[PDB]
């Protein structure tokens, strides 16, 4: 049973899963849109949006707490600069997931996840 258990293990050990989520968060912050499997993107949406909410308080404390998740200097700089400037005044829902198709090698369901403020044609 898994009644009211609310995160995906993603077929990995806990340390591997946390490392992969941190890497995906850094990749999404650096390149504003990335392509990945649907399940991984849905886990990343849970993981990464509380991290973007921490940039609404530009302090040393919030920078350090964000760095505890990220451990990436360039990602931290971009996130507390341009990403924060763009996602100010948006009350959550910073990301969007759109499905695209299937892979040749394993028929994995594919999608891309992006930040809604860096897509112009989607208003």
């Amino acid at each position: 049973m898994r009644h009211n258990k609310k995160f995906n293990h993603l077929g990995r050990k806990a340390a591997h899963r946390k490392a992969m989520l941190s890497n995906m968060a850094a990749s999404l912050i650096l390149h504003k849109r990335i392509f990945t499997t649907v399940a991984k993107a849905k886990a990343l949406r849970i993981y990464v949006e509380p991290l973007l909410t921490k940039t609404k308080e530009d302090t040393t404390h919030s920078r350090r707490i964000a760095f505890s998740y990220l451990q990436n200097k360039y990602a931290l700089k971009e996130l507390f600069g341009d990403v924060a400037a763009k996602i100010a005044d948006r009350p959550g829902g910073y990301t969007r997931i759109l499905k695209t198709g299937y892979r040749l090698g394993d028929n994995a369901a594919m999608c891309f996840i992006e930040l809604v403020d860096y897509n112009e044609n989607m208003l």
Partner: protein
């Protein structure tokens, strides 16, 4: 552990009754005019729900 008898052609086909290939869920593009998977970005034009999503 071991089949006592070999199966007849009829028995084999009766089991294989329920083997089938799933039909994809295809929607028509009202503007573009082609097939794409429902709830999925139309890869020919890159549009999704009337808005451009993937810029060629």
């Amino acid at each position: 552990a071991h089949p006592k008898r070999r199966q007849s052609k009829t028995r084999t086909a009766k089991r294989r009754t329920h083997d089938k290939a799933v039909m994809p869920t295809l929607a028509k593009c009202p503007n573009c005019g082609a097939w794409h998977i429902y709830h999925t970005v139309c890869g020919d034009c890159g549009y999704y729900r009337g808005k451009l999503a993937i810029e060629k």
